[PDB]
Amino acid sequence: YTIAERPDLRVLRDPFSAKPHVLFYASKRVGGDVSDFAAIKLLKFAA
Amino acid sequence: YTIAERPDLRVLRDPFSAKPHVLFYASKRVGGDVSDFAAIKLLKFAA
């Protein structure tokens, strides 16, 4: 499984949007799926 | 009479709110009323 990430949590705050409010904006970006299909096995309870 | 206040003054400004404009925003918080109803007397122009 390969996780791709940007190793920072970018933070934004703005009184400028709504004058009595601060409206914190915190975000980071991340993505991933499997990368080696033969490297992960599962268990199904079907049959 | 009792005055409650904070001595600071906040001078928020924002070209980000109205794009041809600046919107100088100033706020100081202050509050109070009478604390002793006996310490003060008035003069009413009536009979």
| 3 state DSSP class of A37 | helix
State which approach was used to obtain the coordinates: cryo-EM
Tell me which DSSP letter residue B22 carries.
-
On whether the CB atoms of residues A13 and B14 are closer than 8 A, the answer is no
On whether the CB atoms of residues B10 and B28 are closer than 8 A, the answer is yes
Contact B16 A14 (CB under 8 A): yes
Distances (CA, A) of A9 to A4, A25, A26, A29, A45: 14, 10, 7, 8, 39
B25 touching chain A per CB within 8 A: yes
On whether the CB atoms of residues A6 and A29 are closer than 8 A, the answer is yes
**Chain A positions in Cβ-Cβ contact with residue B14 (cut-off 8 Å):** 15-16
B14 touching chain A per CB within 8 A: yes
